[PDB]
């Protein structure tokens, strides 16, 4: 049963504004088990009018991060041991109780383009989007510096961008050298 | 000794090269590596695409009498980015999150010249040869925006003349008054406090938009366009049909 | 006419619980399943959520998903100089069969 | 034959046709 | 009916062929197979030679 | 050394057309690449830009 027989199709076009210097999420495409194919995304940029002439270059980046369901479980159950292991999540799926449950709308969910669900008149969205965004943000931060500040599963807003080169790396430095070397 | 050393020293550097070359496993993969074990691979996230571009510029000049005399003009910035990558098949699936960030120029402006900001003294090359230890790099060597107390504090502990291998600066002349050049305001760079918290992969929580009229306004206006084709094993069962009033009314089947 | 593209519709997967499908059971499903309101748009009254709009399909709400609208975080009061928005905001849900504009 | 004014346009694809649905299915099929 | 049957009957035999063709996983691999999951491979023993 | 170029931008409003208002813009570019003279005690290279 884990073999391709049919196909899905999504076509989401969205528009919005995001402040400069902030790592603003734009979209969140869901991927279920035993699925694959091609993904094509495009984003336009248009800044507000700037007085005079601009010579300092402005850089715009586009990034895509794949967050497995296993990683998202760790944030939801951090204190639990073996929380993010494949067998644990695999077993919990068989139980019947949904692994992820709906939560109220948040800026991350709203900016990711997921439309809500009217549950008793209240907008609802699954918790996976928020958890995935926080884990993706941490993954990007860890690339520049492993011992970077980590976001919990309580974040419900955009995050500041990440520097291209830290001060310590720029000078090829170190906070605490070793005596053996 | 001197054989356990010269081996532990060399073996230590191998450990250091694993934590940074294999992030998000620091202080845990090296331990398993020494004992000859491995980690669970499927829990970790990974990157799919990474695109960057520098915004272009177009200048529109005013033609009215006031604009011609004063020299009024506008700068328009726009860019396009797109990628096409395959989706990684997994047993339990995952979430693909996209990001779009606009940043100013990351170039320093407040940093004393290593040579011209210090005393002109004759170096002892012979003595410098016998120097293979981490020397201090105290504050006041990175920027002139340092408080009285912070000058003595050590920011990072590394290097022998490392502050002279490369020097990069981009900023306005100190003689110039920033109140002017409001029509040539080509200044947008990160004025990080520096010195304090040298290790930081995070932008300041509030980055003002000096060139823009409103600093708190969201300058950019992004339009996204995503198309995804995802082979899936879902059944996608049949499509029912409507009911014909003639049947069950005139008894065509009887 | 303006663009005929939907803007108010929950995501079939991300707006519902993440549950493991029983493929064997879904094979033995060749009957018209209900498609209740609140599966087509989030602009639904309290009473209309339970009502059945049309009675068809097995996972038919996932074969194709098309959306074109502004981000919910954005304030429509802005982008009055980039007002590229003209699409039919049909009430939906009520009167699913309708070949007539408002 | 009492209409004396223009009429609203016609949708390119109805909601029911968009999802390939039906208001009242048949029991025989 | 007679289509759910003639399919459940055929689908049942496929399940039967997995428990015996893949022993030491009976009544557990078929359940995961239906939902589209897998088992941990490294725990199981295996045979090397038979003379 | 170089002589600045000129570009003329004319007003189009009614007042500018009648009076004939216009602006003059002057700009230039200068650059050189020379070797640094090696000395035992060094020196200072000072650059100037005069209009």
Numbering used by the authors:
A (entry chain A): 3 to 183
B (entry chain A): 257 to 510
C (entry chain A): 359 to 460
D (entry chain A): 155 to 183
E (entry chain A): 257 to 307
F (entry chain A): 308 to 358
Original paper wording:
Subsequently, using a different purification method based on a sucrose gradient, we obtained a virus titre comparable to that obtained with CsCl gradient, as estimated by plaque assay. However, examination on the cryo-EM grid showed that all the particles had ejected the genome. The ejection likely occurred during the blotting procedure due to the reduced stability of the S120 variant. Otherwise, only subtle differences were observed between the major capsid protein models, built into the maps of native R120 and empty S120 particles. The respective models exhibited an average RMSDCα of 0.55 Å with the maximal RMSDCα of 2.3 Å occurring at the base of the protrusion. Here, the residues move towards the capsid interior as they are not repelled by the pressurized genome, thereby inducing the unfolding of the protrusion loop trimer.
Here, we have characterized an exceptionally large microvirus, Ebor, and provide crucial insights into long-standing mechanistic questions. Here, we report the structural analysis of the genome delivery process of a Microviridae phage, Ebor, along with its discovery and characterization. This phage, infecting a model aquatic Alphaproteobacterium Rhodobacter capsulatus, belongs to the microvirus taxon ‘Tainavirinae’ and recognizes the host via five Gokushovirinae-like trimeric protrusions. The capsid exhibits the triangulation number of T=1, being made of 60 copies of the major capsid protein. The core of the major capsid protein contains an 8-stranded antiparallel β-barrel (single jelly-roll fold), the fold shared among all Microviridae.
